[PDB]
A and B are shown apart, each in its own frame.
Chain A
């Protein structure tokens, strides 16, 4: 029959969970955001649509930090994103408290994974309306991840989600091909600023604001930090220059 899409944990005759699929729509309808894994860290960038001149520039920050070595950015329903990060923070604090060492990226990914998958198990809750890109540096390298509303996630070389995910992914694929040896944190920051600019064409109607953050063993000492001032402008320009 029909109606298999009115309740969250229901399997449709073809084995799908339609509510999760509708959650995805909310994600694809959101701002574009990406992540780029470099030779000793990861970079996060996101598009910030300027609804109007009234928005105080640089004030409505979207990228969030977890513990001190992890960055998280997401596209979709922002409140759902914050919710997931709050959980991640409690989750990381708990891990550190018992094991002393700050939580490993893979371990952290699964914590978010299980929590998100949990929200597809009952009809008393709604799935998360965000795909999340996050990662950082740990005992053995840099790690980049992307988590879907279904709770599905994998490690990535580069990742994008949101309105312009296709442009971004296209760009990321080029980078992957033209740099088998590995990009550098410095390079990744610029390359990220470019992709956000290119991917902004799928929304070229409204003006936007660029936001970047990174975590590099050499550039930030393994701590997540935001890109500001000179390093930021230098990346903005590198984009504005290749956008023509």
Chain B
């Protein structure tokens, strides 16, 4: 049993017709201190999988080492390591889910919320979540922490059910994701303006965008607001 120290906030994601999109800002909080700003919380595994992590950063780094090892180990005595026998997003997830549940079962959890996004070898999209309790679930859209409360409602307006997937394009999806990130920047006190976004498309492959920034924010209406009730000036 422990307590998170340096933490990463929301991780949001959704799937579109040709793949999945996942994003997460670059902040590493220390309580209410916005302590670190160059933290990458999206971990690419191979070229068909990206793992988004929130929660304790020290544990995130541990999961990173684990993922690198998975790649190294899968390459051993594997002549088809970059072909038929490369790591599938589902393998990477089942692995992490296993670890997450074993650790909570030993009363020593990896204090994180994880979302594994990718495209299977047969082209199928992959989006599944696992957290410190070992709980897992899939949905056309998935978000952790604050994003679960504010991103999902927005992302679900694009893909409310399975049949909305084929009707959604990368442009629509990426736009929804970028807007959600802005909303989270407005209301989440542990969020950052800088973030990374990655797309895993069954045709274009893995696109990993770094250093994005929330833009087009509305703040002007603030000038009109004064006092907290009766004040006029």
**Is A93 a contact of B75 with CB atoms below 8 Å?**
no
Contacts of A93 in B (CB 8 A): 69, 72
* Stretch of A45-53, A59-67, A125-133 contacting B (4+ beta carbons < 8 Å): A59-67
**Is B76 a contact of A89 with CB atoms below 8 Å?**
yes
Please tell me which one of the listed residues B75, B77, B79 contacts residue A68 in the complex, with CB atoms under 8 A apart: B75
B106 beta carbon closer than 8 Å to chain A: no
A241 beta carbon closer than 8 Å to chain B: no
Contacts of A226 in B (CB 8 A): 79
Please tell me which one of the listed residues B69, B72, B75, B77 contacts residue A61 in the complex, with CB atoms under 8 A apart: B77
In chain A, positions 11-70 with a C-beta closer than 8 Å to chain B are 59, 61, 64-65, 67-68
Instruction: For residue B185, give the distance in angstroms from its CB to the closest CB of chain A.
Output: 34
User: Bound complex: CA of A200 vs CA of B185, how far in Å?
Assistant: 69
In chain B, positions 37-77 with a C-beta closer than 8 Å to chain A are 65, 69, 72, 75-77
Q: Write the B66-106 contact mask toward A (1 if CB under 8 angstroms, else 0).
A: 00010010011101000000000000000000000000000
**Is B65 a contact of A97 with CB atoms below 8 Å?**
yes
Instruction: For residue A81, give the distance in angstroms from its CB to the closest CB of chain B.
Output: 12
Q: Name which residue of chain B comes closest to A92, CB basis.
A: B72
Q: What is the interface residue range for chain B against chain A?
A: under 10
Q: Name which residue of chain A comes closest to B82, CB basis.
A: A225
Q: How many A-B residue pairs have CB under 8 A?
A: 15
Instruction: For residue B23, give the distance in angstroms from its CB to the closest CB of chain A.
Output: 28
User: Bound complex: CA of A220 vs CA of B76, how far in Å?
Assistant: 17
**Is A65 a contact of B69 with CB atoms below 8 Å?**
no
**Is A64 a contact of B77 with CB atoms below 8 Å?**
yes
**Is A68 a contact of B72 with CB atoms below 8 Å?**
yes
Contacts of B72 in A (CB 8 A): 67-68, 93
Q: A93-B69, A97-B65 are in contact. Are A65 and B79 (CB under 8 A)?
A: no
Chain A CB count within 10 A is highest, among B65, B75, B76, B79, for B76
User: Bound complex: CA of A152 vs CA of B65, how far in Å?
Assistant: 34
User: Bound complex: CA of A64 vs CA of B69, how far in Å?
Assistant: 17
Instruction: For residue A57, give the distance in angstroms from its CB to the closest CB of chain B.
Output: 12
Instruction: For residue A105, give the distance in angstroms from its CB to the closest CB of chain B.
Output: 17
Q: Name which residue of chain A comes closest to B79, CB basis.
A: A61
Contacts of A68 in B (CB 8 A): 72, 75
In chain A, positions 77-124 with a C-beta closer than 8 Å to chain B are 89, 93, 97
**Is B65 a contact of A65 with CB atoms below 8 Å?**
no
Instruction: For residue B64, give the distance in angstroms from its CB to the closest CB of chain A.
Output: 12
Q: Name which residue of chain B comes closest to A224, CB basis.
A: B75
Contacts of B69 in A (CB 8 A): 93
Q: Name which residue of chain B comes closest to A64, CB basis.
A: B77
Instruction: For residue A212, give the distance in angstroms from its CB to the closest CB of chain B.
Output: 14
* Chain A residues near B (Cβ < 8 Å): 59, 61, 64-65, 67-68, 89, 93, 97, 226
Beyond the given A64-B76, A93-B72, could you list 13 further A-B residue pairs with CB under 8 A, ordered by the A residue number? Answer: A59-B79, A61-B77, A61-B79, A64-B77, A65-B75, A65-B76, A67-B72, A68-B72, A68-B75, A89-B76, A93-B69, A97-B65, A226-B79
List the 5 closest A-B pairs by CB distance, nearest first.
A61-B79, A68-B72, A64-B77, A67-B72, A65-B76
What are 15 contact pairs spanning A and B, CB under 8 A? A59-B79, A61-B77, A61-B79, A64-B76, A64-B77, A65-B75, A65-B76, A67-B72, A68-B72, A68-B75, A89-B76, A93-B69, A93-B72, A97-B65, A226-B79
